[PDB]
Design a protein around this nucleic acid. Sequence first.
DNA 1: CTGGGGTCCTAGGACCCC
DNA 2: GGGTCCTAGGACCC
Length: 342
Amino acid sequence: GSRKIIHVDMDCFAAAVEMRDNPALRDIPIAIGGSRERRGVISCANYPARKFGVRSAMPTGMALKLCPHLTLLPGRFDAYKEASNHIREIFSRYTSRIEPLSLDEAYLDVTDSVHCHGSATLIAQEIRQTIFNELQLTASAGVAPVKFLAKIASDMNKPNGQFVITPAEVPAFLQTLPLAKIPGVGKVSAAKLEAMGLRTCGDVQKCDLVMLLKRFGKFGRILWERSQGIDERDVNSERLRKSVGVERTMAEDIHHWSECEAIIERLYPELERRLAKVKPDLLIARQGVKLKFDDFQQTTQEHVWPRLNKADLIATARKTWDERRGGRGVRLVGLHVTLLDP
DNA sequence: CTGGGGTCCTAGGACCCC
DNA sequence: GGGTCCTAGGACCC
Ligand SMILES: Nc1ccn([C@H]2C[C@H](O)[C@@H](COP(=O)(O)NP(=O)(O)OP(=O)(O)O)O2)c(=O)n1
Ligand SMILES: [Mg+2]
Ligand SMILES: [Mg+2]
């Protein structure tokens, strides 16, 4: 039923806002991540740092081994939040059909738009431009008839570029497209798929659908459909936050309950403030806790609960601390609430 | 040498209904 | 024998 979807993605979003504000970081390797002393990971890295192999979700310990002159910045969320809200208002000028996927990211449906005539290519081009003129940062775009193809397209000519995929180009695009580039196919599934000899969508096009439903369930249908180019998901501008969590990893494993309670005492005020901005009465559906151990196993305990309550969080945290710790060190403790169904 | 914020999926037992 | 809720956990995303 061919639609036209624009996936915009900010390039090096967190880093780019650090460089715009201080140009001294424009041409030196910078990353936002948090110290190796605090056991942190890289969240964003500029291209000078990317040249050394620094990627997002990489432990800072390895980021420094690869690029020792990394200037690590901690990040200013409100600086990135304002930029985003500006980005989303720039989208508001071309369609109401806007589905943000994060701060730096949004699906735009422009099928029924009158703007740069009907050219999804020129709308994406002008949005990418207006962002630069108004925020001095750069965007990439992808244009496709479906959601995931427009997302894959947003990475192909980045940074500061776009890439269009028309319906006639789709069959050739999918034939060589490796399965792991499909959003929702990460490291584990890509490894089993390659264990079955499935690397590209061209390979799964020659597969049996009932076979894939046997082995992967609902995931096998999604797999088989994306390879045929099928992605009926609508751009939904109505999607709502469903949960609020606050967690913290300490410098080193903590071994006594006394220390773990000292962390919850600090975590709770932050969780309440962030819950208050969205729900002033603090009324919720479930609240609970999370511990992650030295062997990186993690357990959570959540239960029905009417209102964000600190003592019950401490209480339940010691029940896990006793029943499921088994004497290992603890590197992370976290708090959580599940919001009420709208 | 492994973050912090989330979404979505699965699955067994409890629970309720015929 | 059905269905929805409850809970824990895992894969995945930015
Ligand atoms: N694992 C990750 C991935 C992204 N992020 C944050 C930091 C990024 O600046 C922001 C943008 O997500 P992203 O698109 O995946 N990466 P980024 O936009 O910075 O670089 P490119 O999109 O140009 O590849 O999300 C994170 O905190 N942890
Ligand atoms: Mg980006
Ligand atoms: Mg993004």
